[PDB]
Amino acid sequence: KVFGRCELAAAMKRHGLDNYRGYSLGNWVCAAKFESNFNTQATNRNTDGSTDYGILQINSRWWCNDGRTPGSRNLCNIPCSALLSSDITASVNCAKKIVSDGNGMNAWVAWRNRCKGTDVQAWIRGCRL
Ligand SMILES: [Cl-]
Ligand SMILES: [Cl-]
Ligand SMILES: [Cl-]
Ligand code: NA
């Protein structure tokens, strides 16, 4: 599924991400924009053999099981394919764990490089939320 901007904002709010760990909804929408361009089916291989999955590009090195990432963990206790669903519940639940892990949203390198410090409210501009 490719979400629209406000559509995703609303779904993230619906699943309790708005202001989760103090990160406003625009931060989460911005992260999704630059991780996946709002496409729930996005997958990208990392040079080390792990893969990133879904709207927030969650990495099989730590967070989900894909069966092909040696030595990895599965701290969200989910198959990585669950992170590709149209329904964003599994990605949101796992992202809540990731952002609680100590470094906040810096876990998403694209968020640090492209969202952090910027006018992230622009991402929810005009949205009926
Ligand atoms: Cl594995
Ligand atoms: Cl959803
Ligand atoms: Cl933080
Ligand atoms: Na894994």
From Swiss-Prot:
Grouped into one coarse class, the protein's main location is secreted
Localization terms from the record: Secreted
Instruction: Name the enzyme's class.
Output: hydrolase
Residues covered by the C-type lysozyme domain = 1-129
- Write down any Gene Ontology CC term: cytoplasm
The organs and tissues expressing this protein are described as: In the egg white and polymorphonuclear leukocytes.
Looking up SUPFAM superfamilies in the UniProt record yields: Lysozyme-like
Query: In this UniProt entry, which cysteines form S-S bonds?
Result: C6-C127, C30-C115, C64-C80, C76-C94
What residues form the catalytic site here? Answer: E35, D52
| Alphabetically ordered keywords of this record | Allergen, Antimicrobial, Bacteriolytic enzyme, Disulfide bond, Glycosidase, Hydrolase, Secreted, Signal
Family annotation (InterPro entries): Glyco_hydro_22, Glyco_hydro_22_CS, Glyco_hydro_22_lys, Lysozyme-like_dom_sf
GO BP: any one term? defense response to bacterium
Q: Which residues bind substrate?
A: D101
MF terms from GO for this chain are: beta-N-acetylglucosaminidase activity; identical protein binding; lysozyme activity
SMART domains, alphabetized: LYZ1
Give the Pfam families listed for this entry.
Lys
**Catalytic activity line of the entry:** Hydrolysis of (1->4)-beta-linkages between N-acetylmuramic acid and N-acetyl-D-glucosamine residues in a peptidoglycan and between N-acetyl-D-glucosamine residues in chitodextrins
Q: Does the keyword Membrane apply?
A: no
Source organism's superkingdom? Eukaryota
Give the EC number: 3.2.1.17
Give the family, as the similarity comment puts it.
Belongs to the glycosyl hydrolase 22 family.
| Comment field (misc) | Lysozyme C is capable of both hydrolysis and transglycosylation; it also shows a slight esterase activity. It acts rapidly on both peptide-substituted and unsubstituted peptidoglycan, and slowly on chitin oligosaccharides.
Q: How does it assemble?
A: Monomer.
Q: What does this protein's UniProt record list under function?
A: Lysozymes have primarily a bacteriolytic function; those in tissues and body fluids are associated with the monocyte-macrophage system and enhance the activity of immunoagents. Has bacteriolytic activity against M.luteus.
The name on file for this protein is: Lysozyme C
Species this protein is from? Gallus gallus
